[PDB]
Each structure stands twice: as C-alpha cells, then as structure tokens.
Amino acid sequence: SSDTTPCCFAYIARPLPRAHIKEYFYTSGKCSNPAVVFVTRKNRQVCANPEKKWVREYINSLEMS
C-alpha cells in the first residue's frame, strides 16, 4: 500500500484480560516484527507477541465463535 500501515515496536508484557478483547489482526509482513494486535472492547489496540502461549490461546478462542 502507499498508505501507512500499523507496525508494533513493543509488546504488552503480560496478558490482557481475555474478556476485554473482541478482535485481533496480524500486522503486515513488511513490518520488522511479527505482531498480533488485539482490539479491546473500548476499541484500544494492543500489540502482542505471537510467540507467547497466551497470545496463541487468545487467538484460538477468538476464532471459536
């Protein structure tokens, strides 16, 4: 794209409360870091590390319904 695209340069260090998260997306593969961005129920966006167990677990849960 010739528009900006979001990248993550820090990850949240501890799990967000699951119940506060309603969506996720992956940042572009063009970014220097892989990242998951969780979207909260107050529509905040939070960067997280795909390598972490809780992150993969949250993703699996979000795809379950």
Ligand X SMILES: OC[C@H]1O[C@](CO)(O[C@H]2O[C@H](CO)[C@@H](O)[C@H](O)[C@H]2O)[C@@H](O)[C@@H]1O
Residues forming contacts to its own copies in the complex (CB under 8 A) are 1-13, 27-28, 30-32, 37, 44-47
The closest of 42, 28, 26 to 16, measured between CA atoms, is 42
In the complex, least distance from residue 46 CB atom to ligand X, rounded to whole angstroms? 11
Q: What angle do CA 60, 55, 36 make, to 5 degrees?
A: 100
What are the φ and ψ backbone dihedral angles of 23, each rounded to 5 degrees? -155, 165
Q: Please state the closest distance from residue 40 (CB atom) to its own copies, in A.
A: 10
In the complex, which residues of this chain contact ligand X (CB under 6 A)? 1, 3, 5, 9, 28-30
Residue 17 binding result from ligand X, its own copies, none, given CB thresholds of 5 to 8 Å by partner type: none
In the chain, the amino acid numbered 25 is: F
